[PDB]
Symmetry: D2
């Protein structure tokens, strides 16, 4: 089969020919229908040799949808042809977190060497993929696979981050979204669907501000040194109830701390190595909690799919072939994909 | 009347003779029965002139209990002689936070010049004190005033910090308490009363570790460079579900980040200027939230009093006269009060 | 001043001429700008002499908005001319429930003889009204008073009922609204604003089903014997996550029990004397909780006003003069007010 | 192997000799170390033929602990010899409820024919038992199996019921426990461990009131017509924040409605056919919610085990052999087991 793999440290990913896998006991083979590109793939490929621990080669793609092609021995609850999304942050299935479906917060996965597809195990950017267990498949019914693939991370991750503090986001609340890319453009729409928060979007790029308004942001303002004052003008001095920072640069985290309300929240979702919130007296308002959330839970993925099926999420995508996978990664690096890049195999 | 006041920047507080106040409309005059000393009073008195904004003179004491002495015009929900605790973090009473009793998170108090007794308004370290409004009094019935005074901050503040994340602290959870002083020795007991968390106490001083065990800590660990490893030995690699840091020095916050569990919590309650948690990827576990809480809510103070009335809080105190107030502050500075210092007027 | 009063048991309310009140200490005099009619006023007026305990005469109107006309002695936080909504379910202000703003669940109000305006104290269906305390006023700014008056009960009560179980109403959930009248037509819109629930409305009247669709219901079902099966056809066998019954007749409660999901909720909001849910094994699904909520909380009223100010609530009203008040009650009895009746004084 | 089975409608269960099962793919074979008797087994055996749908014969025992004896093909995460408790209310594993571990509220189990061990599938009252999937085993380490077996239902069910409303049970709250038997005596201890609620126990039997005080109830009062007034004397007119009714007779539900506080809770846990709370205006306080909870969740079972391992649960048991199983059921029917009956193979 054709796949896109990271094969050597510091190089671009390459299109390869590797064996179509066969599912072992408990596993499911999917024919992949769509595979999302995530900025996290750039972080992974930019790691120096000393830091990179995901193994080479690595089939990329941790945003996967497909149809069930073959059932491994003992697998029940799915039939051949069923359309499914892949739950990404595989856990042990047995710990207290995993028992609640919160496999993103599994305490045993690292020690057991359990890694996500595309991030240590073979990913979705290939004609076929293996999923370890039936509990890591969620049915999508007739959802368009191209718009469905991003739900698995671009949807799930902001959904989880918002869910952690949803009770704060009542009528009269304000939620700031920093970074209107793959994650952020979905984050805006989640906020509109599951809360009555006023949504203020922030981006460096005026076209992304336009995207923010297109997907339902109440206001969209330019990132950088003037953003905190501009946000405060809109919120009137109380500041923002919650800030969801999908950039996570020191500058955006600083903006977040300068606008967050008393008893509010900052969710540092975007990854920029070394950047951090400074949570201390006189550096942040009283009661304003800060967290770096990770991916999301099993039940959250089902809820994201339910939002998509109800017409609440307009996922902006651009489609690529497998052969164009490396080109698509170049596009993502330069910031020229308006929403999510999605590879559609054959 | 006799009072203890901060009267000049950089000097020790002094015993003064000032007029006994009379309550205006809506106000209540209390005969003070006990006034707690808090380490925050040291922070206040150590502020340079440029930072200090609480006015001079200032009658100290933001931990107050008393009996109703005189009712201001229109006050009817209390009778003369009623034993009451003073709710400290006065708010506007009208905003969304205040409507929920969360006057600690009032968004209008600063603009309206509303300050706590002992922290901008006249405090409890005096024979009598004024309370602005009936809603800032909570009945204590026949509770011993000496042990009751600390409930208003040494109890309330840890109670609020714990309450923010109480759902995390189920059976099998671990809570670390750093600093077994006024607040910390009460924090341990709150954890034991309202949760099934295993409690690990951390202090520099062996006698404070003894105090921790006396009030129900399951284990005691010496603070400093070995603490993180010692805590991990006790928690077995998962780390601590929650860390309540009543010291808030950079070293204790660092210990907290090194032991907190995935999807756990660090509550930075202690104040050490400049110190902060560094909340960013690779510097803290996924999902581990961090906050600097402030004081507590009206209903929380009622709950703290209910714990005390049910025999769940053994408050360790040493009693001082008003004349000994300055000496008691020297004792607190040197770390020689085993629990809470409490002034009992005349 | 002109007012509408219930003056004798079993008779229609009458237009009267009574003295314009003067505010005592702590009280506020409002010039009333709008006064809502509620079906609860019909229940009150239909009580026989033996049951009726609200006093005669009674100025009706427990849905009140106005402008501050006079401040009683000692009142702060409002100026003459301020536009305000009246928080209805007055409590003692001091108990644990009231400290959280939950004066609807005050444990002391009955013993202290604290009754709501229009329901034991003089109501809003008059040129002027007294409010007991500043904490019972919520600013509305420039909101149209006619559409604002219903927020105080037609908005607040469904808002509270929904808020009790909001975490259940995630994407993929279904909420049934039974009774598309004053409360129900607002309930539908609240559900759409604060949740991603699919909303199914139920009414006896096809024109009310049309109203339900106009205000955002996803589906509309005729009430009566076929309703339960019709709702199950829409929900596909799982049943409805929550049922908000604004009728509360035995037949509607029975429908609710027959459609509610496992681990779901029935909120019996409508009042029909003698009607009750039967909560026992084999009579209701496992985990499906049932409650009769009452009115709402202070912070909830603020949230309702915030929804209105954000354009999320289209309140359907018909306006009446004070002289037409009795006629408007006849209209409400016959079911001919499409939404909420609102009296606008002079 | 020896087992205790319900074999004909209306008869007492019998001790039988049946084949030791072998685990299929994904399944685990346990050597049973303890099997709890539950009053629900009496309800099941008292069903007439028309209502009984669990199949005959049925190996009883839905409270099971054991050691892993054999792993079925493909099973990982457990080794032979591991001490485990059996999670009872098996669900589909895939629906929204099951994804949260809330298999007790699974919406698909009935349609898929998934039934609990001892309640449609073969139970724990036997030398060996099959468990369908690894996710239905919870490690217990060195916990005494006799005291551990009741954790799976006598512990789990009250734990779930309490957990549904735990945020209500702050300092100053009162929780009433009606029925100090298998479930109720554990419910009291759960309340003491995870809340600061004052606990008032209610029972018909003075010896059970003594049990309640022994396991930490703050007061223990006689059930019946005077109970509501006696409870109100203790709570001072506000009533009880929550009432956990482990009897569920109409009389106890009525007591519950007569004492519950405004914005409180009644959890109808005990099963008495036809009995129900009457939740309507003028019949219950404003805001007092009522529910019939069912069993508990996967993560709750882990939490119950954690309470037991921390020494927070003193489970009162009486031990029986397999041969004594039928005799033990007679004891349970007459109300003469002080706590939980447990069969040890
Ligand atoms: N915490 C997690 O679990 C998790 C999961 C998925 C992705 N991520 C991270 O989230 C981030 C976003 O991922 P993505 O795929 O949406 O990225 P993307 O490349 O699709 O989008 C980036 C967007 O951010 C904007 N941007 C960049 N710098 C900015 C600044 N200083 N201010 C405002 N806007 C700015 C860009 O203009 C663009 O719109 C990445 O760091 C990624 O690794 C984290
Ligand atoms: N967040 C709030 O709203 C709030 C309210 C009250 C107090 N505070 C702050 O909480 C802190 C504690 O106040 P207190 O009155 O309980 O103080 P205290 O002087 O009574 O107690 C200090 C304790 O911390 C211990 N300690 C000091 N350094 C330590 C270290 N490096 N590691 C471990 N233990 C250490 C001491 O040995 C002592 O037991 C102060 O900074 C105070 O200002 C905050
Ligand atoms: N719980 C509380 O705190 C609280 C507060 C306010 C009102 N209420 C009660 O809520 C109820 C609704 O009040 P309202 O002012 O909105 O009433 P309303 O007269 O404006 O509306 C009644 C609506 O219910 C519909 N209806 C009547 N019988 C029905 C049935 N069997 N099935 C379906 N629909 C039916 C009518 O067609 C109409 O659309 C009343 O009983 C009132 O007393 C309760
Ligand atoms: N909801 C669920 O998922 C679930 C799970 C397990 C058990 N149950 C049910 O819980 C109930 C309790 O089971 P158990 O095994 O603990 O029973 P048991 O036979 O061990 O205990 C019964 C106790 O209730 C007392 N009692 C009986 N009638 C009473 C009354 N009127 N007032 C006060 N006390 C009274 C007895 O004196 C005894 O102490 C049963 O109906 C059982 O079927 C329900
Ligand atoms: Zn990603
Ligand atoms: Zn795990
Ligand atoms: Zn203090
Ligand atoms: Zn305020
Ligand atoms: Zn009404
Ligand atoms: Zn009250
Ligand atoms: Zn049972
Ligand atoms: Zn299921």
């Amino acid at each position: 089969m054709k796949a896109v793999q990271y094969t050597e440290i510091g190089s671009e990913p390459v299109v390869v020919d590797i064996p179509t896998p066969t599912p072992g006991p408990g596993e499911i083979l999917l024919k992949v229908t769509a595979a999302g590109l995530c900025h996290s793939d750039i972080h992974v490929m930019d790691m120096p040799a000393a830091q990179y621990a995901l193994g080479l080669p690595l089939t990329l793609g941790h945003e996967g949808v497909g149809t069930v092609a073959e059932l491994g021995e003992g697998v029940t609850g799915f039939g051949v042809g069923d359309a499914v999304a892949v739950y990404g942050p595989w856990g042990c299935g047995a710990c207290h977190a995993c028992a609640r479906g919160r496999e993103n917060y599994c305490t045993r996965a690292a020690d057991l060497g359990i890694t996500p597809p595309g991030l240590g195990s073979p990913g979705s950017m290939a004609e076929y993929m293996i999923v370890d267990s039936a509990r890591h498949l969620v049915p999508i019914g007739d959802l368009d696979p191209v718009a469905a693939a991003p739900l698995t991370d671009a949807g799930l991750t902001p959904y989880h981050a918002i869910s952690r503090v949803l009770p704060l986001l009542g009528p009269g609340s304000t939620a700031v979204v920093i970074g209107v890319g793959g994650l952020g453009h979905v984050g805006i729409q989640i906020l509109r669907a599951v809360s009555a928060a006023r949504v203020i979007a922030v981006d460096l790029d005026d076209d992304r501000l336009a995207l923010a308004r297109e997907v339902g942001a109440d206001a969209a303002v330019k990132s950088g040194a003037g953003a905190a004052d501009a946000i405060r003008e809109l919120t009137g001095g109380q500041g923002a109830t919650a800030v969801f920072d999908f950039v996570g640069a020191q500058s955006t985290i600083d903006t977040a701390q300068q606008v967050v309300a008393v008893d509010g929240h900052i969710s540092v979702v975007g990854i920029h190595a070394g950047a951090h919130a400074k949570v201390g007296f006189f550096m942040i308002p009283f009661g304003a909690s800060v967290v770096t959330p990770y991916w999301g839970t099993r039940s959250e993925l089902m809820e994201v799919v339910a939002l998509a099926r109800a017409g609440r999420l307009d996922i902006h995508t651009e489609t690529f072939t497998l052969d164009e996978g490396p080109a698509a990664y170049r596009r993502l690096r330069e910031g020229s994909i308006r929403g999510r890049g999605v590879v559609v195999p054959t």
